[PDB]
Amino acid sequence: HNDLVQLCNPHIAAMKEDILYHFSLSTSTHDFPAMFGDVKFVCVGGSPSRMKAFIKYVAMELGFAHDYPNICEGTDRYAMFKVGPVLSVSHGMGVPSIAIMLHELIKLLYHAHCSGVTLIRIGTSGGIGLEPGSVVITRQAVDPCFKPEFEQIVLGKREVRNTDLDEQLVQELARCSAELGEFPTVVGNTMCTLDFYEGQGRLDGALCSYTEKDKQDYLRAAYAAGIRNIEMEASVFAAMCNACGLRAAVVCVTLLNRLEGDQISSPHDVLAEYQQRPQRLVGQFIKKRLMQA
Amino acid sequence: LVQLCNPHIAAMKEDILYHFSLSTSTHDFPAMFGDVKFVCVGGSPSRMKAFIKYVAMELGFAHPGADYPNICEGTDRYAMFKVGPVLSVSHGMGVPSIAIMLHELIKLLYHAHCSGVTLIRIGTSGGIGLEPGSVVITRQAVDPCFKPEFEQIVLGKREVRNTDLDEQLVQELARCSAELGEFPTVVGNTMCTLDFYEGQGRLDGALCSYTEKDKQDYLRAAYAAGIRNIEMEASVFAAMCNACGLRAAVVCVTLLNRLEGDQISSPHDVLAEYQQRPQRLVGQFIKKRLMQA
Ligand SMILES: O=c1[nH]cc(F)c(=O)[nH]1
Ligand SMILES: O=c1[nH]cc(F)c(=O)[nH]1
Ligand SMILES: OC[C@@H]1OC=C[C@H]1O
Ligand SMILES: OC[C@@H]1OC=C[C@H]1O
C-alpha cells in the first residue's frame, strides 16, 4: 500500500490558486492529477542536461523507447521531464536552490494526489579516500562539524531538523549497484556545505587563508567521522523529505579524491562517464521496483 | 587592478574554472576578458542574455548578425556573454550558487589582469512596504537577524565578513535612476536568506508552522530596521567583493510587496517589464561611465 503525499502547511488547502513560480506551473492553468498522478519515482540532480539525459536513459531501459518535452518550458529556473512513472527534475547548485525546488515539487506531488513516491538525488561530489568515480550512497547527510543536522532560520530563529536517510533504501540501493557490478559503491556519510571552495577545504578559490596541511587535517577528521564524500545539497534534501515523511536517498558519484586535490582535471570523457554512474544505479533500482509485485 | 586573497593561485601551472568550463590552458583570458570594465551578474541566463543585448544596442554595437555567443557553451551551470567592456554572467539561485560563480569570476578577472572593474548584481526580490516594481539599490546586505554580516564555515570553524556596499556607488546609481525618471527607486537594506519560503516568512511553501501574524511582525521588524527588500544573494556577493577590494553594487526590482502576500501573481507581461528596470538603471550607469574617460 502506497501512502498519499502530505504537506506540513495547512495554508495550501485554503488558496484559490497555487502558483509554482519557479516551475512556471499553476493549479489554475495545469491539471496536476492528469499530469503527475501516476509519478512514483522522482529523480533530482543539478544539471538540466544531465536530467534530460537521465530521462532518455530511463526510457530505453523500461522499454518506453521509440522526444521529451521540458515540462518547465515557461522558465529557465529548473528543468522537468516525465516518462511513465518517472519524473526527472533539475535543481541547480546549493541548498537554497534545491530547497526552492523541493517546496514546489512536494506541493506539485501533493496537488497531483501522488502516492508511494520515492525521491532520489543523483549528483556529484568530492570523495574522501576513494578512487575517483566511486559512487557513495549516503546514510547520513551531515553538516561541516559532522553532525547529522540541518539548521534553518525561520523568522530569525534557529530551527534544527534531523538529516538521516531511510536505512532500508540505502541497503536496497547498494544491492542494485552490486547487481550491475560496473563501478565501486560504498555507503558512507556525506558532508553538505554552503561553499564549494573555502567551504570544502579547497586551496583553489579566490580566497583562502589556510594551508595544505590544514586542509588535510580537516579532511582526515571528516574521514574518521565516517564521511566519504562532500557536496552541497544532501542536507536540506534529507531534512525536507524527513519533515514530510517521503522515502528518500542520495546517490552521488565522486569526481576526484579530495585527499589528492581540489581541481577537477579528469578529461571530459571520463567526467561524463562518471556522471552516467548514479543514473545507471538508479535506473537499476527503478527497473527492479517495476519488475516486482 | 583586480586581485585575490589567495596566494596559491599564482603558483598553479593551470587553473581550471570547472563550473564555467573554462581553463587557463584552453582559454586565453587576457585576450577574452582584459578589456572588461563592468561585470553584471543575475540569476537567470535568459535575463542575462537579454541584458547583454539591450546594452549592446544602447552603447551602439547593435549590428545586424547580432548574435551574442554564450562563452560558457561548455556547461549548463552558468551562462556568460560579452560585448565591449561589458560582461554579463548568470549565477543561479542562492548564496552557494553565486559564491561558486564569484570564486571563478574573480579568479577569471584576475587572470585576464582586468582593471577599474565594477560588479553589479541585477536581480529580483520581494519588497517590504513598497509598491511592486520598485527598484531597491542596496546599502547594506543584512542577514535574517538584520546584521551586516555574512557567516561562512571554513574547516569546521565559523567566520564572518562585513557586508557593506560602497557608499559612493549606491548614490551614483540613485542619481542614474533619477535621470531616467521611469520607476521608483529607493536605497535601503536587503535581507539575504537561504530559503525563499520559510526563510522569507512565506506561508505558501510545503512547510510552514507559523501564522500570518508572525510573518507581519517579522517583516515589520525588518522594515523598522531599514530593510526594504528580501532576497538570496546579496550578502555573499558583498562579502566577497569587500574581501577582494572590488567595487560592487546590488540593484533588484521587487516583484511583490510582502506585506501583502507571498505568491508571485502578476501577469507575465508585467513581471517581464519589472525585470528590465534594473537592466535600464545599470545601462544608464554604464552609458554615462563610458562618456567620461
Ligand atoms: O560539492 C562538490 N561537488 C562536486 C565535486 F566534485 C566536489 O568536490 N564538491
Ligand atoms: O528572493 C526573492 N526573490 C524574488 C522574490 F520575489 C522574493 O520574494 N524573494
Ligand atoms: O560542482 C558543483 C556541485 O556538485 C555537487 C553539488 C553541486 O552543486
Ligand atoms: O525567485 C528566486 C530568487 O529571486 C531572487 C533571488 C533569486 O535567487
Automatic annotation (TrEMBL), chain B:
One of its GO terms (cellular component) is cytoplasm. Pfam families: PNP_UDP_1. One of its GO terms (molecular function) is uridine phosphorylase activity. Pathway: Pyrimidine metabolism; UMP biosynthesis via salvage pathway; uracil from uridine (phosphorylase route): step 1/1. Phosphate binds at R77, R121, I122, G123, T124. Keywords: Glycosyltransferase, Transferase. Belongs to the PNP/UDP phosphorylase family. Its EC number is 2.4.2.3. It catalyses: uridine + phosphate = alpha-D-ribose 1-phosphate + uracil. NCBIfam families: euk_UDPppase (TIGR01719). InterPro entries: Nucleoside_phosphorylase_CS, Nucleoside_phosphorylase_d, Nucleoside_phosphorylase_sf, Uridine_phosphorylase_euk. Substrate binds at Q200, R202. GO terms for biological process: nucleoside catabolic process; nucleotide catabolic process; UMP salvage. Catalyzes the reversible phosphorylytic cleavage of uridine to uracil and ribose-1-phosphate which can then be utilized as carbon and energy sources or in the rescue of pyrimidine bases for nucleotide synthesis. Shows broad substrate specificity and can also accept deoxyuridine and other analogous compounds. This is Uridine phosphorylase. Residues 37-287 form the Nucleoside phosphorylase domain. It comes from Bos taurus.
